Design a protein around this nucleic acid. Structure first.
Ligand code: SAH
Length: 327
DNA sequence: GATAGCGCTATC
DNA sequence: TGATAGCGCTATC
């Protein structure tokens, strides 16, 4: 993450829905805002959230009386992405886990926060011939909110990871917010190799397999792209190896494969998966962040987390727009 | 709950 | 196209 000195969000209060690891919290908190509520049903997710913030999130959002939610100014939610990701059976709203947005909508209707800040996968945009995005657009407008959305890739914001997500910022119609903008991209100066751990700490993640085929050769030049080097087995998800000289492929939560959830990387002549801490780093988490004790749950957690640095920039801008009230 | 081999879609 | 990436799905212990 980065340091912000013009804490544009100082007096505001926010809600951390689908908290997970708290990526949103870290993000807004660094801009001066204060988290007044958190929600997360996963036992293991609750444990890390507590380890790091001292709070234990409330349970299943579905059975929560919206009125019970504290007055808040910003609503943060990176709702479930399985039903929309290019990686699954795209059942969308028909999927048992595709309706959460509507819960967001009921919370919005009742609480009327100044800002709604959501995050989802890139395919959310194209899904069902854009009909899903549309339902989300109209619903929002209908509740009296402007709807701004853009697909941003983390590699354009200082993090060596290809993670194209769609960000939806909605402003209550009152405040004539006509000056909001998404952060301007910038050259990538940090690559995977820069975030790795000393070999001593990683020895146990090394995986030597015989069906390890090598398609391309290691590169000499650093590049802001996922340069694949090899494949293992049939080369499906989790069995593809990348160069630590490019950028990390997207980390996943339920991903399988021998290089389960992080993909594999050629580190100093050896083939291995990323260590939880490295995932944290690749998501822009500070090294002070305490990872969950079960590596399986740590990988899952980071798999569906959010790239902090990006949210920071966006949060800052959200701040700037709200603070421009000239005479 | 932890592990891993899958088989499909979007994108150009 | 033909080759790549994808906050995944699901069967086994
Ligand atoms: N009905 C529900 N109630 C509460 N939390 C829920 C839920 N359905 C899914 N979740 C939680 O939704 C989360 C989505 S992942 C989003 C993670 C968050 N942005 C962070 O930065 O890490 C998961 O933790 C999942 O357990």
């Amino acid at each position: 993450m980065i340091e912000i000195k013009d804490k544009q969000l100082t007096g505001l209060r926010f809600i951390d829905l689908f908290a997970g690891l708290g990526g949103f919290r870290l993000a807004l908190e660094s801009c001066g805002a204060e988290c007044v509520y958190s929600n997360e049903w996963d036992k293991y997710a609750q444990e890390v959230y507590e380890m790091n913030f001292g709070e234990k999130p409330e349970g299943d959002i579905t059975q929560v009386n919206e009125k019970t939610i504290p007055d808040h100014d910003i609503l943060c939610a990176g709702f479930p992405c399985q039903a929309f990701s290019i990686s699954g059976k795209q059942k969308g709203f028909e999927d048992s886990r595709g309706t959460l947005f509507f819960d967001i909508a009921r919370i919005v209707r009742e609480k009327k926060p100044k800002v709604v800040f959501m995050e989802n996968v890139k395919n959310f945009a194209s899904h069902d011939n854009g009909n899903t995005l549309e339902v989300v657009k109209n619903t929002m407008n209908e509740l009296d909110y402007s709807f701004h959305a853009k697909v941003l890739n983390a590699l354009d914001y200082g993090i060596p990871q290809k993670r194209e997500r769609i960000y939806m910022i909605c402003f209550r119609n009152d405040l004539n917010i006509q000056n909001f903008q998404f952060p301007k991209p910038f050259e990538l100066n940090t690559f995977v190799k820069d975030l790795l751990l000393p070999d001593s700490e990683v020895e146990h993640l090394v995986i030597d397999r015989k069906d390890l085929v090598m398609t391309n050769q290691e590169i000499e030049q650093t590049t802001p792209k996922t340069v694949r080097l090899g494949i293992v087995g049939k080369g499906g998800q989790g069995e593809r190896i990348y160069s630590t000289r490019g950028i990390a492929i997207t980390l996943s939560a339920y991903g399988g494969g021998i290089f389960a959830k992080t993909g594999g990387y050629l580190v100093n002549g050896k083939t291995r998966k990323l260590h939880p801490r490295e995932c944290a780093r690749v998501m822009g988490y500070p090294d002070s962040y305490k990872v969950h004790p079960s590596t399986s749950q740590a990988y899952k957690q980071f798999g569906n987390s959010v790239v902090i640095n990006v949210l920071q920039y966006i949060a800052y801008n959200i701040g700037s727009s709200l603070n421009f009230k000239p005479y």
